[PDB]
Amino acid sequence: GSRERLVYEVRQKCRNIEDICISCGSLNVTLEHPLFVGGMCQNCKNCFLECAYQYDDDGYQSYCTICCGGREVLMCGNNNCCRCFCVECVDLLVGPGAAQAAIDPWNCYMCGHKGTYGLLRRREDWPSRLQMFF
Numbered sequence: 001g002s003r004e005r006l007v008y009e010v011r012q013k014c015r016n017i018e019d020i021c022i023s024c025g026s027l028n029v030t031l032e033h034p035l036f037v038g039g040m041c042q043n044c045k046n047c048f049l050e051c052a053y054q055y056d057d058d059g060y061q062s063y064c065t066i067c068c069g070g071r072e073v074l075m076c077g078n079n080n081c082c083r084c085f086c087v088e089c090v091d092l093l094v095g096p097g098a099a100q101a102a103i104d105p106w107n108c109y110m111c112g113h114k115g116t117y118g119l120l121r122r123r124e125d126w127p128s129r130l131q132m133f134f
């Protein structure tokens, strides 16, 4: 329950989101997350690299953009994107109830006009950051 407790501490202004891995909750941050404000640990970086741009038979990405896992997911309707975000990450980082409110069509957090969704904030330079990340 480390990720949940740490996100709660972020909300209570007792912790900077840059100091936690937003994917798994590890405090062993080794880089800035390339897509969102917040940290990332080296294990999650490796997972992100290995899971990036793998696709299920429905044509959408296999693995949640944030935690690299997921079962029930929100799926981006932008065909140039095709990303998925699991309901657990959305309820944690956007906030309680956000996932079931996000369920037409749906542009994901990387594609929408707004970049701030609760504690989830899209990085300005994310396309170029991905180039450096990969």
Ligand SMILES: [Mg+2]
Pocket (backbone or CB within 6 Å): 062, 070, 071
């Ligand atoms: Mg799967």
Ligand SMILES: [Zn+2]
Pocket (backbone or CB within 6 Å): 021, 022, 023, 024, 025, 026, 040, 041, 042, 043, 044, 045
């Ligand atoms: Zn991690």
Ligand SMILES: [Zn+2]
Pocket (backbone or CB within 6 Å): 064, 065, 066, 067, 068, 069, 070, 085, 086, 087, 088, 089, 090
């Ligand atoms: Zn997730």
Ligand SMILES: [Zn+2]
Pocket (backbone or CB within 6 Å): 076, 077, 078, 081, 082, 083, 107, 108, 109, 110, 111
């Ligand atoms: Zn998208």
